[PDB]
């Protein structure tokens, strides 16, 4: 909340400094000076406010963010891959169950004793 | 170890089936309560020795089968346990050249 | 935590860029110190955008690790099935032996 607002203010100050450097000498250098000083003070504030919290994100998440993609991209691909994997193992298990049922029917056709013992198992 | 090619898988079925292979199945043989030495204590009974040499003993001298054909240990039994054209082939138990 | 360390590193990089802009404006030309300051400002803006992206990644959906753990469990189950097959293979090696 407040940290996001501080980051947005820092981005706005950076944009203003870039515009002042790109424009003309008329732009007050003292104005950009005070802006940089306030940005440093706000960064020290951004720090102090965020110095004891969270502690997570040990993932290539940074690589995906720096890989010209948002979680709305690389994270989506990872979730889709995980969903494909989980759907595939379910198909594996279902086909295994079908083959087991087929062989159970065949072994019931083979021996009546086996039919009785698998009925006891069930 | 991937295998699973339709051709690779098809070879497996033929090789496995070849080694393994209306009933035409051997006559069921039940309990044997009197064994010739320990069970009946009839060791050296002369009737038993005569029976093994010439008489048909269902399990000591041969396999009865169904349809009545009698197969001795030296002979090879051809039988068809599944209801299919393919027939199981018991090679001779003794195989004395 | 980690975002705090990233913000501290960004502040240190901004201080280094300010020192470099000082050196450029001091030994740099009038049309050179301004360009160096603009480049340092663009770098600082890129760092701030990266920090905002890091915050959005720390937020948004917090199930990425859950999905990764589910995929790891599925892979472990598949590896267990493969190990079962290899155990059957070594068992049949011992059998043919």
């Amino acid at each position: 909340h407040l940290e996001e607002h501080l980051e947005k203010f820092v981005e706005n100050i950076r944009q203003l400094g870039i515009i002042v450097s790109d424009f003309q000498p008329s732009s007050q250098a003292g104005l950009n000076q005070k802006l940089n000083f306030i940005v440093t003070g706000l960064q020290d504030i951004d720090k102090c406010r965020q110095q004891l919290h969270d502690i997570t994100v040990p993932l290539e998440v940074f690589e995906y963010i720096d890989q010209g993609r948002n979680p709305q991209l690389y994270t989506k691909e990872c979730l889709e891959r995980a969903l494909a994997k989980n759907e595939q193992v379910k198909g594996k298990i279902d086909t295994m169950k079908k083959f087991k049922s087929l062989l159970i029917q065949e072994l019931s056709k083979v021996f009546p004793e086996d039919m009785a013992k698998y009925r006891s198992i069930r | 170890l991937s295998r699973n090619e339709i051709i690779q898988s098809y070879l497996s079925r033929q090789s496995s089936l070849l080694s393994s292979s209306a009933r035409q199945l051997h006559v069921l043989v039940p309990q044997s309560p009197p064994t010739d030495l320990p069970g009946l204590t009839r060791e050296v009974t002369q009737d038993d020795l005569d029976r093994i040499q010439a008489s048909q003993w269902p399990g000591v001298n041969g396999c009865q089968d169904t349809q009545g054909n009698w197969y001795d240990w030296t002979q090879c039994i051809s039988l068809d346990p599944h209801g299919d054209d393919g027939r199981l082939n018991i090679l001779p138990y003794v195989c004395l050249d | 935590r980690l975002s705090t360390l990233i913000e501290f590193l960004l502040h240190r990089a901004y201080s280094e860029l300010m020192v470099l802009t000082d050196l450029l404006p001091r030994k740099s030309d009038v049309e050179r110190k301004i360009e160096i300051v603009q480049f340092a400002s663009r770098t600082r803006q890129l760092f701030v955008r990266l920090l905002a992206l890091v915050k959005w990644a720390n937020n948004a959906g917090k199930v990425e690790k859950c999905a990764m753990i589910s995929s790891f469990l599925d892979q472990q189950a598949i590896l267990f099935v493969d190990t079962l097959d290899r155990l059957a293979s070594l068992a049949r090696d011992a059998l043919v032996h």
Binding site: - | S19, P92 | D85, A91
Partner: peptide, 25 residues
């Protein structure tokens, strides 16, 4: 005969193996 029986038992056990392998594949 007995060698055929041993080979048949081994092929039966392998049957399990190949079937499960195919399934996982």
């Amino acid at each position: 005969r007995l060698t055929q029986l041993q080979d048949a038992v081994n092929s039966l056990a392998d049957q399990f193996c190949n079937a499960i392998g195919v399934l996982q594949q």
